[PDB]
C-alpha cells in the first residue's frame, strides 16, 4: 500500500509558527492539530459547531483553523431519517476562529469505530460522509442500503439480520415490535456486529 | 467567545 504524507494540513497562512497546544481557559482539557472541538455557536441554545483542529497559532492572542464538521441539519440537503442523533459530515470548509471560542473536546469517532462504543457519551460523534459546503456533495455519494425501506443504516436504530438474506430488518418493518425482535433466538426473513461490518452493494 | 463562520 503506497500513500502519501502531506506536510501540512492548513493551506491558509502557513508562514505563522505553529503553537504544539492550546490549554482552554480553567481547565485541563488540552487542545492539539488533529483534535476536535466544540465551539459556542452565535445562536443561543444550539448545539454547539464542531470542528477539526488542523493548525494552532497565536500573535502579539492564540488563533485555530478550523475545518467545519457539519450536522445533517446544518447542511443543504438538511437531516433525512437515516442520519444518527451523532452523526457528522466532514466538509471542505476552512475558518480561523479565536482558540477562546473552544468550549471543550470531542471525538469524531470512524462510523465502525462508533457501532462499537460500549457507551455513547455526549462528546461522542462519528463521521461516515465527507462534504462539499460549495455544492452539498457527498463523499461517497452511493452507500449500502438495507431492508424493505431501502434506507442507508441508521446506527441508532435496532435492525436484525436475517440468517438467509444477511439483510438487515428494521423490525417495525417486518412487522413486529423492538421487544419481540429483542426476544429471538433465531431469524429469517420473509424474503427468504452491525451492517458497519457488511461489505457488500451500493446505491446513490 | 461566540464563534462566526465564514460563508463557505
Ligand atoms: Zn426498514
Ligand atoms: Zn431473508
Same mark, same amino acid.
Given at each position: 500500500? &503506497?500513500?502519501?504524507?502531506?506536510? =501540512? ?15 482552554? %481557559? ?20 444550539? #448545539? #454547539? ?20 464538521? /457539519? ?13 444518527? &442523533? ?9 475558518? =480561523? *476562529?479565536? &482558540? ?14 462508533? @457501532? ?8 461522542? /460523534? ?6 462539499? &459546503?460549495? @455544492? ?9 442500503? /438495507? ?5 442507508? /443504516? ?6 436484525? *439480520?436475517?440468517?438467509?438474506? %444477511? ?6 418493518? =417486518? ?7 429483542? %426476544?429471538?433466538?433465531?431469524? =429469517? ?5 452491525? #451492517?458497519?461490518?457488511?461489505? %457488500?452493494?451500493?446505491?446513490? | ?8
Amino acid at each position: 500500500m &503506497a500513500k502519501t504524507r502531506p506536510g =501540512v494540513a492548513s493551506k491558509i497562512k502557513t508562514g505563522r509558527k505553529e503553537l504544539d497546544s492550546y490549554t482552554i %481557559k480553567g481547565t485541563n482539557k488540552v487542545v492539539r492539530a488533529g483534535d476536535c472541538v466544540l465551539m459556542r455557536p452565535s445562536d443561543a441554545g444550539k #448545539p #454547539p459547531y464542531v470542528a477539526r483542529v488542523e493548525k494552532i497559532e497565536a500573535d502579539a492572542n492564540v488563533k485555530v483553523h478550523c475545518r467545519w464538521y /457539519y450536522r445533517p441539519e446544518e447542511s443543504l440537503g438538511g437531516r433525512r431519517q437515516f442520519h444518527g &442523533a451523532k452523526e457528522l459530515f466532514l466538509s471542505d470548509h476552512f475558518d =480561523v *476562529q479565536s &482558540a477562546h471560542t473552544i468550549e471543550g473536546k470531542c471525538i469524531v469517532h470512524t462510523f465502525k469505530n462508533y @457501532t462499537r462504543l460500549e457507551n455513547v457519551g455526549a462528546e461522542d /460523534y462519528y463521521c461516515r460522509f465527507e462534504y462539499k &459546503a460549495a @455544492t452539498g456533495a457527498f463523499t461517497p455519494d452511493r452507500v449500502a442500503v /438495507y431492508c424493505k425501506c431501502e434506507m442507508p /443504516y441508521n446506527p441508532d436504530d435496532l435492525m436484525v *439480520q436475517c440468517e438467509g438474506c %444477511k439483510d438487515w430488518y428494521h423490525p417495525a418493518c =417486518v412487522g413486529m415490535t423492538i421487544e419481540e425482535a429483542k %426476544k429471538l433466538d433465531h431469524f =429469517v426473513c420473509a424474503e427468504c456486529s452491525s #451492517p458497519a461490518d457488511d461489505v %457488500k452493494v451500493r446505491l446513490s | 467567545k461566540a464563534a462566526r463562520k465564514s460563508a463557505p
